[PDB]
CSV table of C-alpha atoms in Angstrom, one decimal:
chain,number,residue,atom,x,y,z
J,1,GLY,CA,-31.8,-14.6,19.7
J,2,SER,CA,-31.5,-11.6,17.4
J,3,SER,CA,-30.5,-8.4,19.2
J,4,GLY,CA,-28.1,-5.6,18.4
J,5,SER,CA,-25.6,-5.2,21.3
J,6,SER,CA,-23.9,-1.8,20.8
J,7,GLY,CA,-22.2,0.4,23.4
J,8,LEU,CA,-19.1,0.9,25.5
J,9,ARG,CA,-17.8,-2.2,27.4
J,10,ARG,CA,-15.3,-3.0,30.1
J,11,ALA,CA,-12.7,-5.8,30.1
J,12,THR,CA,-9.1,-6.5,31.2
J,13,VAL,CA,-6.2,-7.3,28.9
J,14,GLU,CA,-4.4,-10.7,29.0
J,15,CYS,CA,-0.9,-9.9,27.8
J,16,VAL,CA,0.6,-7.0,25.9
J,17,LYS,CA,4.0,-7.5,24.4
J,18,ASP,CA,3.8,-6.9,20.7
J,19,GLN,CA,2.2,-4.0,18.8
J,20,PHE,CA,-1.0,-6.1,18.8
J,21,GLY,CA,-2.6,-7.5,21.9
J,22,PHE,CA,-5.6,-9.6,22.9
J,23,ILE,CA,-8.4,-8.6,25.3
J,24,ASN,CA,-10.3,-10.9,27.6
J,25,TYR,CA,-13.6,-10.2,26.0
J,26,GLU,CA,-15.8,-12.6,23.9
J,27,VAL,CA,-17.9,-11.0,21.2
J,28,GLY,CA,-18.3,-13.9,18.7
J,29,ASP,CA,-16.5,-17.0,17.6
J,30,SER,CA,-13.4,-15.7,19.2
J,31,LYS,CA,-13.0,-15.6,23.0
J,32,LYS,CA,-10.6,-12.5,23.0
J,33,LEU,CA,-10.6,-9.3,21.1
J,34,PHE,CA,-8.1,-7.9,18.6
J,35,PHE,CA,-6.8,-4.3,18.7
J,36,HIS,CA,-3.8,-2.5,17.4
J,37,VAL,CA,-1.6,0.2,18.9
J,38,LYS,CA,-3.2,2.6,16.4
J,39,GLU,CA,-6.5,2.2,18.3
J,40,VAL,CA,-5.3,3.5,21.7
J,41,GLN,CA,-4.9,7.3,21.8
J,42,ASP,CA,-3.9,10.1,24.2
J,43,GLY,CA,-0.5,8.4,24.6
J,44,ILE,CA,-1.7,5.4,26.7
J,45,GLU,CA,-0.2,1.9,27.2
J,46,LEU,CA,-2.3,-1.2,27.9
J,47,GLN,CA,-0.7,-3.9,30.0
J,48,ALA,CA,-1.8,-7.2,31.5
J,49,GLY,CA,-4.7,-6.6,33.8
J,50,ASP,CA,-5.5,-3.2,32.5
J,51,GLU,CA,-9.2,-2.5,32.2
J,52,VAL,CA,-10.0,-0.3,29.2
J,53,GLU,CA,-13.3,0.9,27.8
J,54,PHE,CA,-13.8,0.3,24.1
J,55,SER,CA,-16.7,0.4,21.6
J,56,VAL,CA,-17.9,-2.7,19.8
J,57,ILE,CA,-18.1,-1.9,16.1
J,58,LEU,CA,-19.3,-4.4,13.5
J,59,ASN,CA,-18.0,-4.2,9.9
J,60,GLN,CA,-20.5,-4.8,7.1
J,61,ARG,CA,-17.8,-4.9,4.4
J,62,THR,CA,-15.7,-7.7,6.0
J,63,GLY,CA,-18.0,-9.0,8.6
J,64,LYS,CA,-15.8,-9.0,11.7
J,65,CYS,CA,-15.6,-7.2,15.0
J,66,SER,CA,-12.9,-5.1,16.7
J,67,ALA,CA,-12.1,-2.4,19.2
J,68,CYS,CA,-12.1,1.4,18.6
J,69,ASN,CA,-11.0,4.4,20.6
J,70,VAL,CA,-9.5,2.3,23.4
J,71,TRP,CA,-9.3,4.4,26.6
J,72,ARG,CA,-7.6,3.2,29.8
J,73,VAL,CA,-10.4,3.5,32.4
J,74,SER,CA,-8.6,1.3,35.0
J,75,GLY,CA,-6.7,3.0,37.8
J,76,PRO,CA,-3.0,3.6,38.3
J,77,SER,CA,-2.5,0.7,40.7
J,78,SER,CA,0.9,2.2,41.7
J,79,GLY,CA,1.8,2.4,45.4
């Protein structure tokens, strides 16, 4: 019913080619999430299949949701 779901989450990215990418995480009407290169910090690159931990922040001014402080939690997967 009515419950505030706040906190860090974990999801993998679908495809990252342009400055903006979509994450495989459903928060509302949309199935995927929307984040910009400005979000990610510490000089990190998010690719397809990269699990990153982001915080769900709801905007009261607009009324939409997005990612913030995107941090690549997934491993290197190189070898």
